[PDB]
Amino acid sequence: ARNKIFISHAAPDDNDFTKWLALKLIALGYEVWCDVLFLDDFWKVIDKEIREGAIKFLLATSEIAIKRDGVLKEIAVAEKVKKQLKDDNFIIPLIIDENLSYDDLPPEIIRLNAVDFKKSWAVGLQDLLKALDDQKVEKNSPDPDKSNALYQQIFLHNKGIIEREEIYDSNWFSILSFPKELRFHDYEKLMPKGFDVRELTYPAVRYKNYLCTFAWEYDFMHQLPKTETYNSSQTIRIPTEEILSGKYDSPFIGNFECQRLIVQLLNKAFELRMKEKGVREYPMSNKMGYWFEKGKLEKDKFNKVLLVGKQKDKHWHFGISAAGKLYPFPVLMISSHIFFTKDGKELIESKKIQHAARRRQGKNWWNDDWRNKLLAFVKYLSDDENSFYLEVGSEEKIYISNEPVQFVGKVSYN
Amino acid sequence: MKELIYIHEPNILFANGQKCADPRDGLALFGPFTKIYGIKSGVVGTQYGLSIFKNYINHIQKPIYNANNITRPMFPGFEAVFGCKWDADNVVFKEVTKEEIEKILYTESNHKRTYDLVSLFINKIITANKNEDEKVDVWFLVIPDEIYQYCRAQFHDQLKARLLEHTIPTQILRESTLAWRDFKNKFGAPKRDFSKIEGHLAWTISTAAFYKAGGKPWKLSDIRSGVCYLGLVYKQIEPKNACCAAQMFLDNGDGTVFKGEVGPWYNQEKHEFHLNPKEAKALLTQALNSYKEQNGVFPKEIFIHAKTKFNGQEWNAFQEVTPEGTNLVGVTITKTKPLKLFKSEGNYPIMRGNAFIVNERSAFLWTVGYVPKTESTLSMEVPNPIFIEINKGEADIEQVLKDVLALTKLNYNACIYADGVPVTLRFADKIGEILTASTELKAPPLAFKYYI
DNA sequence: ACTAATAGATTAGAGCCGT
RNA sequence: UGACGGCUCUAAUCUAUUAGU
Numbered sequence: 083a084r085n086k087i088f089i090s091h092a093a094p095d096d097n098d099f100t101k102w103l104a105l106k107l108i109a110l111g112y113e114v115w116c117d118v119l120f121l122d123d124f125w126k127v128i129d130k131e132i133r134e135g136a137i138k139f140l141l142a143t144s145e146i147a148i149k150r151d152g153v154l155k156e157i158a159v160a161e162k163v164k165k166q167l168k169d170d171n172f173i174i175p176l177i178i179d180e181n182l183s184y185d186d187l188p189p190e191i192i193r194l195n196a197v198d199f200k201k202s203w204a205v206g207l208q209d210l211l212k213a214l215d216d217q218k219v220e221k222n223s224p225d226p227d228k229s230n231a232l233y234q235q236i237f238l239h240n241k242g243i244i245e246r247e248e249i250y251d252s253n254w255f256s257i258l259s260f261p262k263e264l265r266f267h268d269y270e271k272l273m274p275k276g277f278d279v280r281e282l283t284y285p286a287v288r289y290k291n292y293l294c295t296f297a298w299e300y301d302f303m304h305q306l307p308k309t310e311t312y313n314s315s316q317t318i319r320i321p322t323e324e325i326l327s328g329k330y331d332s333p334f335i336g337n338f339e340c341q342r343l344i345v346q347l348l349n350k351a352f353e354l355r356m357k358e359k360g361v362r363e364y365p366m367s368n369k370m371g372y373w374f375e376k377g378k379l380e381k382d383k384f385n386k387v388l389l390v391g392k393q394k395d396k397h398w399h400f401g402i403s404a405a406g407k408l409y410p411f412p413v414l415m416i417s418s419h420i421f422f423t424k425d426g427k428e429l430i431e432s433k434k435i436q437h438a439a440r441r442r443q444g445k446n447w448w449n450d451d452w453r454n455k456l457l458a459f460v461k462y463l464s465d466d467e468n469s470f471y472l473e474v475g476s477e478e479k480i481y482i483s484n485e486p487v488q489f490v491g492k493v494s495y496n
Numbered sequence: 497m498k499e500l501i502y503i504h505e506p507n508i509l510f511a512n513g514q515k516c517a518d519p520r521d522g523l524a525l526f527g528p529f530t531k532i533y534g535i536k537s538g539v540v541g542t543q544y545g546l547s548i549f550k551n552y553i554n555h556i557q558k559p560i561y562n563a564n565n566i567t568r569p570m571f572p573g574f575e576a577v578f579g580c581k582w583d584a585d586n587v588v589f590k591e592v593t594k595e596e597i598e599k600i601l602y603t604e605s606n607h608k609r610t611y612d613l614v615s616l617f618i619n620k621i622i623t624a625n626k627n628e629d630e631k632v633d634v635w636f637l638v639i640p641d642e643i644y645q646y647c648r649a650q651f652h653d654q655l656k657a658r659l660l661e662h663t664i665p666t667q668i669l670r671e672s673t674l675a676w677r678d679f680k681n682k683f684g685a686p687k688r689d690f691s692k693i694e695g696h697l698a699w700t701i702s703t704a705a706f707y708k709a710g711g712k713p714w715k716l717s718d719i720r721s722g723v724c725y726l727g728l729v730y731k732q733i734e735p736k737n738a739c740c741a742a743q744m745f746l747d748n749g750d751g752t753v754f755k756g757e758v759g760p761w762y763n764q765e766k767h768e769f770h771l772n773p774k775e776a777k778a779l780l781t782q783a784l785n786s787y788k789e790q791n792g793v794f795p796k797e798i799f800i801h802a803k804t805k806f807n808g809q810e811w812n813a814f815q816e817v818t819p820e821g822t823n824l825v826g827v828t829i830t831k832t833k834p835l836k837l838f839k840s841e842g843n844y845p846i847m848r849g850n851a852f853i854v855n856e857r858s859a860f861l862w863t864v865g866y867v868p869k870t871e872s873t874l875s876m877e878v879p880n881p882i883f884i885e886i887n888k889g890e891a892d893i894e895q896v897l898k899d900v901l902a903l904t905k906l907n908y909n910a911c912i913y914a915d916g917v918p919v920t921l922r923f924a925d926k927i928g929e930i931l932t933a934s935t936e937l938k939a940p941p942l943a944f945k946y947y948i
Numbered sequence: 949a950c951t952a953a954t955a956g957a958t959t960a961g962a963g964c965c966g967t
Numbered sequence: 968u969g970a971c972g973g974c975u976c977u978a979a980u981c982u983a984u985u986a987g988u
């Protein structure tokens with residue numbers, strides 16, 4: 083039997099209204115067939131209902147729904163069906179367009195009284211619900227079960243999460259190799275004036291009064307007078323494999339402190355080698371960026387992705403800040419930055435000006451844009467084919483994969 | 497090859513207990529969990545401000561269509577969503593003259609300037625609150641731009657703070673927001689363009705007004721029963737720190753009760769952002785007593801989370817005041833270590849809800865990502881995930897991830913898809929910004945209606 | 949005991965742009 | 968302060984170690 087409320091409208095524009103109203107009517111127990119809700123000849127199926135299945139013909143009337151001949155065809159058949167039903171209360175227009183003068187409609191509907199949706203949808207639905215009970219349109223119970231099915235089929239089945247596997251490129255670059263053993267030398271007295279390790283060319287830190295370093299006792303001889311004459315067989319040597327495993331626990335030094343010294347040495351070595359590499363640096367608030375400059379990059383670009391650039395008057399430079407973190411797995415966490423230079427030769431000395439540029443320039447770049455720039459900038463660091471080494475001693479050093487760690491995820495989107 | 501486990505998006509209850517994943521869709525389709533009869537407006541502004549407010553209310557009466565309707569859902573209209581009436585003609589308007597604002601602004605003392613600017617508005621509401629029979633549910637303060645830019649010991653913080661003793665829900669709306677079209681930065685275009693996001697603005701403002709007027713737009717149900725999700729935030733006073741607590745728990749009927757549990761708490765310690773044993777014991781006793789009075793029996797778990805890590809002494813105090821049969825889980829949520837995941841081939845960020853498990857005691861959770869539901873990612877740039885560390889106690893690292901993700905979905909101050917940080921922490925942050933704006937208040941209002 | 953230095957750590961904030 | 972988010976700039980604490988008071 084006819085227990086369906088046909089809803090006709092413009093296909094590309096009136097979707098929003100009809101979707102809300104159809105779902106609203108479905109939630110109330112009605113049976114509402116709409117093309118947005120149940121379309122899958124198209125004229126034949128809708129005609130069957132209009133002449134057999136439809137019991138009401140709600141016209142979402144607007145300044146375009148009355149210029150859509152396809153829609154006018156659906157009224158033309160409705161009207162006839164209305165004559166077959168003698169149901170004068172059949173076509174029940176729905177004017178949502180306040181722009182529509184309400185008095186510029188086709189003769190077929192111009193004689194019929196609308197249901198007003200121009201001022202607020204809620205009263206109009208109240209008006210529609212008022213009319214529908216008045217005309218005794220039957221309706222089922224508003225069960226949120228089969229109705230739930232339509233709701234999801236419409237919006238909550240869309241929530242679906244593509245269950246295919248994706249590959250994510252992070253910004254973690256693992257440390258490929260650490261030196262065989264950690265050495266604690268003693269230059270306390272050999273230190274000419276207990277100076278810092280700025281003179282030392284190899285990463286060294288004086289734990290307590292022992293200058294522990296991955297460089298051998300004899301390595302420091304040029305920049306270290308008196309230390310030049312240091313005897314061996316008096317250096318505390320700890321296995322780095324035991325340290326990273328958190329197994330070495332001695333009253334001389336704890337595992338936490340030893341890893342702290344390892345992290346500090348790695349940070350210094352990165353800063354050192356950085357100087358070895360051809361790239362200008364930038365003093366950030368709490369880190370050191372590397373503002374690539376003209377000349378160090380062909381066409382201000384490398385590995386097929388620029389690492390340098392020029393703004394309207396200034397010049398953007400893709401820089402990075404490295405902080406090595408043993409947790410969870412030894413990695414060199416790298417962070418992306420953008421440094422704006424006055425003429426690609428000197429960075430603006432105004433932090434506010436630099437920040438306001440970073441922001442505006444950030445709008446242009448995308449996910450792929452950041453990934454390509456980061457990976458290309460790292461690949462410049464490569465010494466051999468698949469990595470690059472950061473000296474931790476004349477003999478010992480730390481190698482870092484030039485590709486970031488890949489993360490693979492269970493799901494994706496459309 | 498590193499494997500990322502996935503946590504799905506929790507469902508939030510709506511009218512008649514129906515579930516959905518987006519407030520902007522769940523409300524527009526189903527309606528609020530609890531319906532109010534209507535909202536009596538209250539406006540403290542100029543004639544210009546009153547005209548703007550009435551224009552905006554009548555504008556949101558009609559449906560609001562934003563440019564990209566597909567990605568951000570449109571606004572049906574206030575009564576069409578929530579089911580109550582919000583008319584612009586029921587305004588109990590209290591006029592503020594630009595001249596009295598001007599004489600306030602000319603005072604040399606900046607602290608006295610901001611105090612007097614707060615005092616004007618609050619005394620006019622205070623006065624109306626006691627001298628107007630017309631009942632007002634929410635007081636909407638249409639402030640001009642001069643207040644916002646000249647006055648900068650904050651206007652908003654003190655204004656919300658100095659009304660707490662009277663318990664008056666308020667909503668500040670800068671006239672730049674409501675009249676954004678007629679507020680241009682001399683170029684001929686609006687200072688901030690709402691054109692493509694007008695519908696979402698209507699969503700946010702209407703949701704905030706509905707919440708502050710006694711309505712519950714949506715509630716949470718995808719959380720473990722018997723657990724009191726409790727969040728601490730520490731705020732600086734210059735050398736004192738103030739701790740604020742917000743607690744969310746299911747009741748006997750499994751309905752979330754979200755309420756603050758905060759009394760003034762000041763700790764003087766060499767270590768920054770910690771708590772002396774007395775303050776910690778008082779805080780936990782307050783929270784446990786609140787749960788006891790709401791549900792009768794004691795919680796089966798006290799899921800304490802914070803942006804900082806707990807030391808030994810305060811945890812021992814926590815355990816000492818805790819009864820038997822109740823477990824304590826202290827979780828630290830940090831958002832500082834940059835772990836930016838770039839998708840290999842494509843142009844849209846990692847999906848929200850992906851989780852990287854470090855080990856049995858830590859994880860990374862992408863509470864910000866790309867949500868297919870709106871097709872609009874919550875982050876313009878690459879989203880930094882939150883580091884969830886089970887600092888103390890025993891817990892399942894995946895269960896904690898799903899619990900945090902669930903707690904990220906109760907931001908009533910904005911009708912966004914979900915919050916980047918768990919809501920208890922953000923609302924406790926707001927409380928700390930307000931409770932400390934004024935002098936220590938006795939029995940401060942414990943309901944967010946009076947803060948956000 | 950207390951100050952200074954070198955760190956990395958852990959947390960605050962202030963703010964400034966984007967949408 | 969309708970909001971959210973990224974970022975930038977400061978600041979302190981913690982811890983270790985040395986120096987000094």
Ligand SMILES: [Mg+2]
Pocket residue numbers: 704909948
């Ligand atoms: Mg608010």
